[PDB]
Amino acid sequence: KVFGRCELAAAMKRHGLDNYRGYSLGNWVCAAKFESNFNTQATNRNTDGSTDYGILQMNSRWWCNDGRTPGSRNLCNIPCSALLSSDITASVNCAKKIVSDGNGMNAWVAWRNRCKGTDVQAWIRGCRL
């Protein structure tokens, strides 16, 4: 499913992401925009053989099991296909584990490179939340 900007914001808020670990809603929406273009079905394979899945592009080497990443840790205890669902619940629960991992949102390279230090509030402007 390809979410609309305000639709995703509303779903993320309802799921407890607004200000989770100090990160305002605009941060999460900006990250999803640049990680997957708001598409739950996005996948991207990496040079090391691992693959990133979903709206927030979580890596199969640490977060989920895709059955083809030797040495994968599966810290969110879910098959990677779960992250591609139209229901963002699994993606949200896993994201909460990741952001609490110590590096905060820097775990998402697109966030670090294109959201961090910008007017992230712009991402939720105009939305009825």
Side-chain angles (χ1 to χ4, degrees), residues 69-125:
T69 309
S72 167
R73 287 197 71 202
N74 198 4
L75 299 170
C76 292
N77 54 262
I78 42 166
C80 301
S81 56
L83 301 178
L84 305 183
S85 173
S86 47
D87 180 348
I88 67 164
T89 307
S91 278
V92 173
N93 292 161
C94 192
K96 287 177 173 181
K97 294 181 179 59
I98 298 179
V99 75
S100 301
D101 205 65
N103 260 240
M105 286 196 76
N106 293 297
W108 288 277
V109 67
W111 176 79
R112 196 175 66 248
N113 291 325
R114 312 173 71 172
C115 300
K116 189 174 185 174
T118 72
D119 178 31
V120 295
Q121 307 93 276
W123 288 102
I124 63 168
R125 265 204 285 282

Side-chain angles (χ1 to χ4, degrees), residues 1-11 29 37-38 55 127:
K1 173 186 174 181
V2 177
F3 275 84
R5 184 178 59 83
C6 295
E7 178 185 21
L8 179 62
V29 175
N37 202 30
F38 303 140
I55 205 157
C127 310

Side-chain angles (χ1 to χ4, degrees), residues 29-76:
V29 175
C30 181
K33 170 62 187 179
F34 299 122
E35 284 294 349
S36 68
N37 202 30
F38 303 140
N39 183 6
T40 63
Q41 294 192 81
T43 57
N44 282 294
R45 199 153 192 187
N46 302 310
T47 50
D48 70 339
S50 63
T51 301
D52 297 335
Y53 296 84
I55 205 157
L56 281 170
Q57 293 288 276
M58 299 159 185
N59 193 256
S60 68
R61 189 167 302 290
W62 311 95
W63 313 105
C64 58
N65 173 61
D66 64 357
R68 67 163 195 199
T69 309
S72 167
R73 287 197 71 202
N74 198 4
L75 299 170
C76 292

